[PDB]
Amino acid sequence: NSTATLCLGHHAVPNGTLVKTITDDQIEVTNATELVQSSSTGKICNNPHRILDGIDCTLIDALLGDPHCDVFQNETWDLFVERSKAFSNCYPYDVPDYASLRSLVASSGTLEFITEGFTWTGVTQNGGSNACKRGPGSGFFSRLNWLTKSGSTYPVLNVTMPNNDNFDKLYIWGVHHPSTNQEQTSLYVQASGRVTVSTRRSQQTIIPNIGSRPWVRGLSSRISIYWTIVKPGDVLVINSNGNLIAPRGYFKMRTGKSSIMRSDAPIDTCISECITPNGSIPNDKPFQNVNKITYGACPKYVKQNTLKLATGMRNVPRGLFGAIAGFIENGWEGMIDGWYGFRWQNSEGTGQAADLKSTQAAIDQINGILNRVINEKFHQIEKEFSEVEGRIQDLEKYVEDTKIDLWSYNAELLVALINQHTIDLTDSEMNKLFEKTRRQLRENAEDMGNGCFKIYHKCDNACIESIRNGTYDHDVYRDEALNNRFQI
Amino acid sequence: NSTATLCLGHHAVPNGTLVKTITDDQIEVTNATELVQSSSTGKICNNPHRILDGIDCTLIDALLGDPHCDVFQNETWDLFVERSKAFSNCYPYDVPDYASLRSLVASSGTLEFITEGFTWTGVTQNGGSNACKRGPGSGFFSRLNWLTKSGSTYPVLNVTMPNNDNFDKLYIWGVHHPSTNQEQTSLYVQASGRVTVSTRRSQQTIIPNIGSRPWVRGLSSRISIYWTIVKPGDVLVINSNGNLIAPRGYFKMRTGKSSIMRSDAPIDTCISECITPNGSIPNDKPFQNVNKITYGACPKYVKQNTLKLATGMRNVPRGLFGAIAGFIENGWEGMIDGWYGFRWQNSEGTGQAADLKSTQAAIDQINGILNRVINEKFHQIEKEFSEVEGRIQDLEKYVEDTKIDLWSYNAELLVALINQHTIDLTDSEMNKLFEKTRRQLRENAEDMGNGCFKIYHKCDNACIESIRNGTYDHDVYRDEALNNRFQI
Amino acid sequence: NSTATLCLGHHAVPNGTLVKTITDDQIEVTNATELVQSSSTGKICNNPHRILDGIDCTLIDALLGDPHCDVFQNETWDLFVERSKAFSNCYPYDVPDYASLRSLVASSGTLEFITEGFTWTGVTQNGGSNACKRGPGSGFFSRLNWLTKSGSTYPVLNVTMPNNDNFDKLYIWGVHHPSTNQEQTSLYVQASGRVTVSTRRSQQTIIPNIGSRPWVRGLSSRISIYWTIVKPGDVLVINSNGNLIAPRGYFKMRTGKSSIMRSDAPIDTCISECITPNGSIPNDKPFQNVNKITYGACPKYVKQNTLKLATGMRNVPRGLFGAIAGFIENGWEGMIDGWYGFRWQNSEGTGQAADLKSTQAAIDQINGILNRVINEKFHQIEKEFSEVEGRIQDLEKYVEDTKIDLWSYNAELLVALINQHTIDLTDSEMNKLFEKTRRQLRENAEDMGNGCFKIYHKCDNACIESIRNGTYDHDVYRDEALNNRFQI
Numbered sequence A, B, C: 001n002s003t004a005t006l007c008l009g010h011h012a013v014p015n016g017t018l019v020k021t022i023t024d025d026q027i028e029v030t031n032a033t034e035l036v037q038s039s040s041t042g043k044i045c046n047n048p049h050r051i052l053d054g055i056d057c058t059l060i061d062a063l064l065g066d067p068h069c070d071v072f073q074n075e076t077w078d079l080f081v082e083r084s085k086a087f088s089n090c091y092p093y094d095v096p097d098y099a100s101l102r103s104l105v106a107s108s109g110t111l112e113f114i115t116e117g118f119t120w121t122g123v124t125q126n127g128g129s130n131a132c133k134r135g136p137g138s139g140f141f142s143r144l145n146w147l148t149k150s151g152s153t154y155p156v157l158n159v160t161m162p163n164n165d166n167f168d169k170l171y172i173w174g175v176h177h178p179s180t181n182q183e184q185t186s187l188y189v190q191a192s193g194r195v196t197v198s199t200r201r202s203q204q205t206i207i208p209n210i211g212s213r214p215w216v217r218g219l220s221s222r223i224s225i226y227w228t229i230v231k232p233g234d235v236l237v238i239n240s241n242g243n244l245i246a247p248r249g250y251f252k253m254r255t256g257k258s259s260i261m262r263s264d265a266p267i268d269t270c271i272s273e274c275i276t277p278n279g280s281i282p283n284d285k286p287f288q289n290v291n292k293i294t295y296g297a298c299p300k301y302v303k304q305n306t307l308k309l310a311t312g313m314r315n316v317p318r319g320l321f322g323a324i325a326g327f328i329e330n331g332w333e334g335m336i337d338g339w340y341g342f343r344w345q346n347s348e349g350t351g352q353a354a355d356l357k358s359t360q361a362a363i364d365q366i367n368g369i370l371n372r373v374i375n376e377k378f379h380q381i382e383k384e385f386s387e388v389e390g391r392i393q394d395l396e397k398y399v400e401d402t403k404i405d406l407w408s409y410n411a412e413l414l415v416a417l418i419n420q421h422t423i424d425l426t427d428s429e430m431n432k433l434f435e436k437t438r439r440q441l442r443e444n445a446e447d448m449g450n451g452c453f454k455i456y457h458k459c460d461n462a463c464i465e466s467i468r469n470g471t472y473d474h475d476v477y478r479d480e481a482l483n484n485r486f487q488i
């Protein structure tokens, strides 16, 4: 043997995975990873977020103090979960802007209630109904005070309560809507009631409407629920000639991370940052396809059910078994110890060795990409709706749909673009190792065109190792090689 | 002739088109295609979407049953088109939340009306006005029932209508606003009217306001229009001591693809998926600059009036007419049969041949890109407004403007980035064919530096063809070539 | 000296700056520039936008004509600035949809007021209060007319005012809310008041609510403020049996660039296109981290406090002082005159020269990128809120947060992607100059593997200059070089 072959090549695998680039619709790589979380455990983890299971109670029924919700008094949450099974079992009521009251109480994160010393002169307090049983007898909302006539008169109620504290007070109050003119006069002497609740800049002016509503728990009557916020330095005044459902005091308002979610998923003893109505999901992936409704440190919702990011190079796996070949022809499935390396034929037979510098350079770039590819949101907007509403709901749905489409586009582009760069940097390290070998060899070898060098001199395993190391002296073999090349 | 020249080159065209990349503000390519649809036919195609021309009717006037809109009874649509010419010709009315009622009826896609057997005891039904002529005599809205006194009394009306069906019922009802106290007492005996319309969870409480409004079709009086949805299992109760404009029954509510658009474009017998107020547009392009208002499978609206995607490579078109040159100097306008190929000078004169593998590889990548570059939206938000409104309209306009700017950015970046990759992959196939030729030739040729090889041996057309094929044996010419190179 | 060394290399700097690419977390470049404006001067520049300092006045108090705001009569602005110090000093009032009235007046950009000849028959005009002093005596809002009884009667007021102009008229009017039934009867004879204000399609129906509000400037009474727009051809009718706070005329409505901002930043005599509440900012950078609230030609708000765009190439700065080396080993800190160039050792010693073509090509591409990297928004949505409101505020905040996150993502990706292309194009120009030199030299030099050529012939400074120029004849040295290469 007067010559040697030194082939440059890269690893390949028997299986392999198809991914998208900018340049190729489908290209096989050695390895890929999923960027879309498509699976939930089905359970909401009660750590690290404080989960409050509403059970049979909406947040509003906990707020008002519906007797079967009295267990939620002074409750606090990071996430209130309202169940499908929830029912109201007190006086039948409406909240004109239900969604807003639900939202601002949810965001406050507390039903911390402070009873205040309201003095109601010339009226009988603590009115009850058989539609709102507490214990054996008739009762009412724990946080509201049903005022009616004393003897045969109902005076103009005119009370004030100053806010001398350094936080916002939330006052929940109501207006009674009697079923008949008979019912109006019996409870509140005047034929037409009135509830004015004001601060220095704000006022609410509500007139009760007499009439039969649908029978609920015995009653065709209704309470309409209102709220007033009073800031530090400001004051509350309540003025009524009838139909006032009075506050007992205020809810202490807070700022921070608290929200509310509709889910029937059971609460479990586990740890997960990200909550969806389907259950907790892991947040290791940048994107998720489980639910557009999320709470906590979550992947971004996208329309795609899968996105495959390349974590490896292009995968390139008839009687001629002796010959060796390089990267121009194909990859090497035998190459265990590295991504790139050498195969040679010489005096001492066939050998193979990985190159760790080229291998590590490729791995370090891909790991750096993965590091950057792998935000916490708390109270957001509602994304599902049980009633048709028109304009506001149309805008809420259009905002979320706009968002999903823009992030879905961002996710599609990012994966295609990074996959393009991963193919390119992995091809680049192969070419760099071939060029680096070419430059060492000088005039002692020529390019066989298959990603291998024909070395035109005796090059034993020690000689080959010197090429694989930095240290090969072209000069010591130059005479021998030039003679082999340019004569025979 | 002891030598040959083999030049590697690519095609060019006399004309050419400027495009944007990341790296170059303007770069000439052989071919480009438009990604922004900037043109409409001016006509809405009535296929495949069911178009309902409102003609002289708004959707609300079709809903209420304004006599000149009676042709729209039980009508269904995918897209209702409201015309500028539309007029109301019945009782003068307002709809407090007009936009929401218009939106939820539009989205429902039907005026399927089911008359119900409401019994109105102690009142005269079917009230009419000269402001709402049907035939020769006075009339009213087809879907509403104007109730007034019978003899000299108007009782407390207290009727119920249960929803035992498995769909949502939409009830349209109204409150009459008389011009004078005289007019109030004459129609409805009580000096002050009342309309309470409720379900188990919802109630609406409306008090009529007596006063002169502007004279419209004889009248300073007005009807205010309200709606109530009642779900399966729930019930409607209507309670009034006066001024009730009664429903005759319900509209059957549906979910799906239906919407409404303001346009004066004529309806034509043609096929187009995408509808704009300017007329139908083709949807072959990813983007459009015609209108931010669209219906159906449409290109995304962007601010740009043109975006040019490269579908070809860089376009590179003094006494020395004999000599040939390669891709380093320029492209070849003569190259008819391919994108890349060969030019040679030898014993048998000057020849030229295209390389189909390199040509097809470039074409297949570009066609794959185009395949991915070439969403259906139905009911959205309003994007134009005839009245100033403040907060809600500001948010609707800000949402749409936010969207347009983000998609305009996405379109600008995508075209620049894909154009960068198209230039790079087209340059790459040229370099790959030059390197592939270099490797075949081994020590029989050297690089002339103009993208041509000087072959240092007699290489006839058969020899050249063997280089253009896979099959060239450097060994059979090596002796001859080394002698030609390293002596003379 | 029978040989020469010609090294190809690029410049480097002692310092250098770390930037992000797609491929590298951190990579050192010779130069970089900031894309995020993080600094304000602290002052709003009064050029080129017309700034109106509200001083002690909100826009609404300027509109209504609160005496201490009478200096703002007929005022116009591009940007109204409301100060924290602003106070109201007239009749205590609420505006049911304050934010909308504030928004549509701000967007109109004018308080141009036209007094109209309203005739109020059977009522005493120009009612005043000690809570609204103008001069020594009691007064009222300049733009409103407080109507009360004349003698002992208050008739049904029924006035009309047609719009025969070709612009929209904005009418500001109000309803008085007395503290007691005593106060209602004394001012307006009827026990229950009424204000109906209508156009042909629109009507507002307001009933006053009697009751004590919190004491403000002597009074527990309140005025509620309403607005009506009347288009050309349409007409206004006002109908009241009491409590009407009458308009004196209309505000002329305009379309265009006008908005409003909350700021305590002082107004200065300087020029800046972009205004934030923190003060004016320069708009040379694409992005800014100062405030999501902006007015004018502004950078886009992003979460990042810094983004570094590469404006230069990769920065690559033991007894062996004689030897020279090329770009494979490192960059040259000595290279003053260019980005790329040549170093050589020959008969006449060591030399160095820059290549201007390669240098200029790299600079022109980078300057073109910077040109494209370096939008005006006027009236937008509110982005900060002094009160909790629920649903609408949740949507306004969610829209802005959605926007910030999408632009922050766009800015992160764009910088990483352009930096990737800047590294690649700067590496490319180096490789192109090395390949261009290689092709000139033909068989007279071989690649030393350090980005230098060993020229195997005597190559003096004139010979080297001919290589640096286009004009080097390999043939004249070929014999000498082949002899030097393939013998000794």
Ligand SMILES: *[C@@H]1O[C@H](CO)[C@@H](O[C@@H]2O[C@H](CO)[C@@H](O[C@@H]3O[C@H](CO[C@H]4O[C@H](CO)[C@@H](O)[C@H](O)[C@@H]4O)[C@@H](O)[C@H](O[C@H]4O[C@H](CO)[C@@H](O)[C@H](O)[C@@H]4O)[C@@H]3O)[C@H](O)[C@H]2NC(C)=O)[C@H](O)[C@H]1NC(C)=O
Pocket: A180, A212, A213, A214, A215, A216, A220, B158, B159, B160, B235, B237
């Ligand atoms: C305005 O118009 C509305 C609607 O028409 C009226 O509201 C209805 O009012 C009646 C009561 O006046 C409700 O009818 C039923 O009342 C029963 C009371 O029980 C006693 O009376 C019945 C007489 O038939 C006896 O059979 C019974 O033994 C008792 O002696 C309830 O028992 C009924 O309950 C309902 O729910 C249960 C659930 O288990 C069912 O089993 C029953 O079948 C039934 O569905 C029922 O409530 C009726 O519900 C009201 N309807 C609505 C829609 O609200 C107003 O009264 C009227 N107002 C005025 C002033 O006239």
Ligand SMILES: *[C@@H]1O[C@H](CO)[C@@H](O[C@@H]2O[C@H](CO)[C@@H](O[C@@H]3O[C@H](CO[C@H]4O[C@H](CO)[C@@H](O)[C@H](O)[C@@H]4O)[C@@H](O)[C@H](O[C@H]4O[C@H](CO)[C@@H](O)[C@H](O)[C@@H]4O)[C@@H]3O)[C@H](O)[C@H]2NC(C)=O)[C@H](O)[C@H]1NC(C)=O
Pocket: B180, B212, B213, B214, B215, B216, B220, C158, C159, C160, C235, C237
């Ligand atoms: C509260 O205040 C409002 C506004 O001031 C009043 O509303 C106006 O009411 C009057 C009717 O009382 C309207 O005036 C006109 O009525 C005409 C009726 O026709 C007969 O009477 C006139 C007497 O001048 C004769 O000329 C005519 O031959 C008939 O005998 C209409 O014909 C008028 O029509 C209008 O439109 C036509 C379109 O073709 C034009 O040709 C006319 O020029 C005219 O513009 C007109 O309607 C008046 O329109 C009402 N104005 C508004 C703005 O609504 C309320 O009456 C008042 N209420 C109370 C209780 O006092």
Ligand SMILES: *[C@@H]1O[C@H](CO)[C@@H](O[C@@H]2O[C@H](CO)[C@@H](O[C@@H]3O[C@H](CO[C@H]4O[C@H](CO)[C@@H](O)[C@H](O)[C@@H]4O)[C@@H](O)[C@H](O[C@H]4O[C@H](CO)[C@@H](O)[C@H](O)[C@@H]4O)[C@@H]3O)[C@H](O)[C@H]2NC(C)=O)[C@H](O)[C@H]1NC(C)=O
Pocket: A158, A159, A160, A235, A237, C180, C212, C213, C214, C215, C216, C220
């Ligand atoms: C419904 O309920 C509300 C709230 O309870 C009542 O509103 C309060 O009304 C009273 C007046 O009736 C307000 O009290 C004070 O009135 C003073 C008037 O000055 C004279 O009277 C006092 C008698 O104590 C003398 O001391 C004084 O010398 C005068 O002769 C004001 O001077 C008070 O001013 C306030 O602000 C100044 C700021 O400098 C402070 O210095 C004072 O300490 C004080 O804070 C004060 O206004 C009281 O403010 C009202 N409260 C609210 C919350 O509105 C309604 O009167 C009641 N309605 C009915 C019909 O009963």
Ligand SMILES: *[C@@H]1O[C@H](CO)[C@@H](O[C@@H]2O[C@H](CO)[C@@H](O[C@@H]3O[C@H](CO)[C@@H](O)[C@H](O)[C@@H]3O)[C@H](O)[C@H]2NC(C)=O)[C@H](O)[C@H]1NC(C)=O
Pocket: A031, A032, A033, A311, A370
């Ligand atoms: C195919 O590609 C995937 C994704 O790059 C490779 O999986 C990743 O492998 C690395 C190294 O084994 C894992 O890193 C380790 O993670 C654990 C847990 O955080 C940590 O304790 C260790 O210190 C280390 O950082 C990484 O988690 C893992 N990623 C995933 C998503 O599974 C995989 O190795 C590749 N497969 C083959 C056969 O090469």
Ligand SMILES: *[C@@H]1O[C@H](CO)[C@@H](O[C@@H]2O[C@H](CO)[C@@H](O[C@@H]3O[C@H](CO)[C@@H](O)[C@H](O)[C@@H]3O)[C@H](O)[C@H]2NC(C)=O)[C@H](O)[C@H]1NC(C)=O
Pocket: B031, B032, B033, B311, B370
């Ligand atoms: C310049 O580039 C454009 C865009 O790539 C080329 O136009 C495209 O040409 C192809 C092949 O001729 C067309 O494909 C055909 O489309 C029809 C209709 O769908 C189909 O029936 C055929 O089977 C085939 O797929 C393609 O539609 C057409 N695109 C456009 C937008 O016109 C064009 O060929 C290039 N010009 C030159 C001179 O090379």
Ligand SMILES: *[C@@H]1O[C@H](CO)[C@@H](O[C@@H]2O[C@H](CO)[C@@H](O[C@@H]3O[C@H](CO)[C@@H](O)[C@H](O)[C@@H]3O)[C@H](O)[C@H]2NC(C)=O)[C@H](O)[C@H]1NC(C)=O
Pocket: C031, C032, C033, C311, C370
């Ligand atoms: C490092 O990179 C920065 C950014 O590319 C270079 O700063 C830029 O330098 C150019 C040329 O000196 C400046 O252009 C000039 O701008 C002025 C003002 O508009 C104009 O009158 C001139 O005709 C010219 O166009 C450019 O403004 C400047 N940009 C910034 C942001 O400072 C800088 O030269 C580089 N540093 C080194 C040491 O190479």
Ligand SMILES: *[C@@H]1O[C@H](CO)[C@@H](O[C@@H]2O[C@H](CO)[C@@H](O)[C@H](O)[C@H]2NC(C)=O)[C@H](O)[C@H]1NC(C)=O
Pocket: A073, A074, A112, A113, A114, A115
């Ligand atoms: C809910 O929390 C509030 C405090 O936020 C409790 O109010 C205190 O009640 C005790 C009763 O002995 C009083 O001594 C305190 O003065 C009250 N605090 C304040 C700030 O007024 C309230 O008792 C709690 N209720 C429940 C059911 O836990």
Ligand SMILES: *[C@@H]1O[C@H](CO)[C@@H](O[C@@H]2O[C@H](CO)[C@@H](O)[C@H](O)[C@H]2NC(C)=O)[C@H](O)[C@H]1NC(C)=O
Pocket: A038, A039, A040, A277, A278, A289, A290, A291
């Ligand atoms: C998470 O829950 C949502 C809502 O329950 C699921 O969305 C529904 O999925 C069903 C079953 O595939 C479809 O029939 C409906 O069209 C979906 N409705 C809506 C409103 O989205 C979602 O598929 C669940 N995801 C996972 C992974 O469990």
Ligand SMILES: *[C@@H]1O[C@H](CO)[C@@H](O[C@@H]2O[C@H](CO)[C@@H](O)[C@H](O)[C@H]2NC(C)=O)[C@H](O)[C@H]1NC(C)=O
Pocket: B073, B074, B112, B113, B114, B115
């Ligand atoms: C509109 O459609 C409804 C059905 O959705 C029609 O209602 C039916 O009318 C016929 C009249 O003979 C009755 O026999 C049916 O009982 C009605 N159906 C229901 C479900 O109640 C209605 O007639 C249609 N009207 C028009 C003008 O086409």
Ligand SMILES: *[C@@H]1O[C@H](CO)[C@@H](O[C@@H]2O[C@H](CO)[C@@H](O)[C@H](O)[C@H]2NC(C)=O)[C@H](O)[C@H]1NC(C)=O
Pocket: B038, B039, B040, B277, B278, B289, B290, B291
């Ligand atoms: C589609 O229709 C819209 C609305 O009519 C056009 O937009 C207007 O275009 C005119 C004429 O160029 C301008 O004067 C207006 O400023 C535009 N108004 C609005 C509200 O956009 C649009 O140009 C039409 N496009 C096509 C291609 O016909």
Ligand SMILES: *[C@@H]1O[C@H](CO)[C@@H](O[C@@H]2O[C@H](CO)[C@@H](O)[C@H](O)[C@H]2NC(C)=O)[C@H](O)[C@H]1NC(C)=O
Pocket: C073, C074, C112, C113, C114, C115
């Ligand atoms: C505010 O501007 C309006 C014009 O927009 C002024 O109204 C004019 O007042 C003069 C007074 O002599 C009359 O002659 C004109 O007829 C009025 N114009 C119109 C269109 O009616 C108004 O005077 C200005 N007020 C202030 C304080 O500057």
Ligand SMILES: *[C@@H]1O[C@H](CO)[C@@H](O[C@@H]2O[C@H](CO)[C@@H](O)[C@H](O)[C@H]2NC(C)=O)[C@H](O)[C@H]1NC(C)=O
Pocket: C038, C039, C040, C277, C278, C289, C290, C291
């Ligand atoms: C511009 O002004 C805003 C609002 O005053 C500043 O934002 C606040 O910054 C302070 C101090 O860093 C923080 O404590 C607050 O959390 C921020 N509040 C809000 C609502 O953003 C902003 O930092 C200012 N920027 C500059 C450059 O002056």
Ligand SMILES: *[C@@H]1O[C@H](CO)[C@@H](O)[C@H](O)[C@H]1NC(C)=O
Pocket: A015, A016, A017, A018
């Ligand atoms: C082979 O790759 C495919 C890619 O879709 C994957 O689903 C499968 O699990 C892999 N199988 C093995 C045995 O590695």
Ligand SMILES: *[C@@H]1O[C@H](CO)[C@@H](O)[C@H](O)[C@H]1NC(C)=O
Pocket: B015, B016, B017, B018
């Ligand atoms: C030449 O190219 C330009 C590009 O703007 C195009 O507008 C024109 O139609 C072309 N002309 C011919 C004859 O191909």
Ligand SMILES: *[C@@H]1O[C@H](CO)[C@@H](O)[C@H](O)[C@H]1NC(C)=O
Pocket: C015, C016, C017, C018
């Ligand atoms: C050196 O570069 C750093 C980059 O962070 C910069 O902050 C510093 O001002 C520079 N110093 C000099 C002397 O150029």
